[PDB]
């Protein structure tokens, strides 16, 4: 069986700017657990049909995961705008996959504030499809150079998420998982289409 539990039921997720990517291949893809789950707030697919994922076979499945705010989950989609889908995590216009997310306020919120999760709100260029920037170089907002020193119109690109105990789901932490699917032997398959690879001792 595919290792979805390793990425979905992980102890600690990464920041949106430093999104962790897993490679799911050569295994049975049980999408039943993903279907019959009332925990999942968002479950939207692009260029495919959620209801019929067991009726499909792909040669690679890149399972990207990270934490963002609830009001920023709408940005996680093809051809969008805003700090997240521009500086942190952008998808291609012709994207093929799904976007999963659930309110993780019970295990990513802290009384004093969870300062493990950050996000980049400053960038000279726009993040290319599936591009990742973990760099921490001083951003130039003004006309004059910074010279790697923080000052006027020159500041740190990263900003911490509050994630303090609040009542507003919009400003609460959400665990997002982007299952990006990919003329080659179809490795990750349904439980029926499985090309006798279920007994490979995955």
């Amino acid at each position, epitope marked *: 069986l595919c290792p979805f539990g390793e990425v979905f039921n992980a102890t*600690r997720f*990464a920041s949106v700017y*430093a999104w962790n990517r897993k490679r799911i291949s050569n295994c049975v893809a049980d999408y039943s657990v993903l279907y019959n789950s009332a925990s999942f707030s968002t479950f939207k697919c692009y260029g495919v049909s959620p209801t019929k994922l067991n009726d499909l076979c792909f040669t690679n499945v890149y399972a990207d995961s990270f934490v963002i705010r609830g009001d920023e989950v709408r940005q996680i989609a093809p051809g969008q705008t805003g*700090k997240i889908a521009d500086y942190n995590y952008k998808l291609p216009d012709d994207f093929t996959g799904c976007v999963i997310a659930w309110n993780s306020n019970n295990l990513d919120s802290k009384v004093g504030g969870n*300062y*493990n999760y950050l996000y980049r709100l400053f960038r000279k260029s726009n993040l290319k499809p599936f591009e990742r920037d973990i760099s921490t170089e001083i951003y130039q907002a003004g006309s004059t150079p910074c010279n790697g020193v*923080e000052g006027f119109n020159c500041y740190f690109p*990263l900003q*911490s998420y509050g994630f303090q105990p609040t009542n507003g789901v919009g400003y609460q932490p959400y665990r997002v998982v982007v299952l990006s699917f990919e003329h080659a032997p179809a490795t990750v398959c349904g439980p029926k289409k499985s090309t006798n690879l279920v007994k490979n001792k995955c």
Partner: nanobody
Framework: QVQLVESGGGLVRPGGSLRLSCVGSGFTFSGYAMNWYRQAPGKALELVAGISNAGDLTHYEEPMKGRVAISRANDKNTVYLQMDDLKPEDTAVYRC???????????????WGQGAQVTVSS
């Protein structure tokens, strides 16, 4: 100006000890919490230790949980990080952090340090 000028660090041998210091100015240092991050070459900034406004509240993460101790001297407007039993994996740029300090500068409310190079080489 809202600034955090961190000092200390350098080169030590495996098992060696070091203390980093972060001095704060241009804001009430005792009014905001202090966090210690570290960035290893190639990896993303990870949280090491976090402390409270001026209280006895210290939170450590898995990375260095055991061989690190966070503390602050609000009288001297400074926060320290006592690192002992250092390993070669600890070789990284350690940064201080005070969240939600800046005001009237948009979502950019955090104030970040410059960075202190720590190298644990045999």
């Amino acid at each position: 100006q809202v600034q955090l000028v961190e000092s200390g660090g350098g080169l030590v041998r495996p098992g060696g000890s070091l203390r980093l210091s972060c001095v704060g100015s241009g804001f009430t240092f005792s009014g905001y919490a202090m966090n210690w991050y570290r960035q290893a070459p190639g990896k993303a900034l990870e949280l090491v230790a976090g402390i409270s406004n001026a209280g006895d509240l210290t939170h450590y993460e898995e990375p260095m949980k055991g061989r690190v101790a966070i503390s602050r001297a609000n009288d001297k407007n400074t926060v320290y990080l006592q690192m002992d039993d250092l390993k070669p994996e600890d070789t990284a740029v350690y940064r201080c952090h005070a969240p939600g300090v800046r005001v009237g500068t948009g979502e950019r409310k955090d104030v970040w340090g410059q960075g202190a190079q720590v190298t644990v080489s045999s």
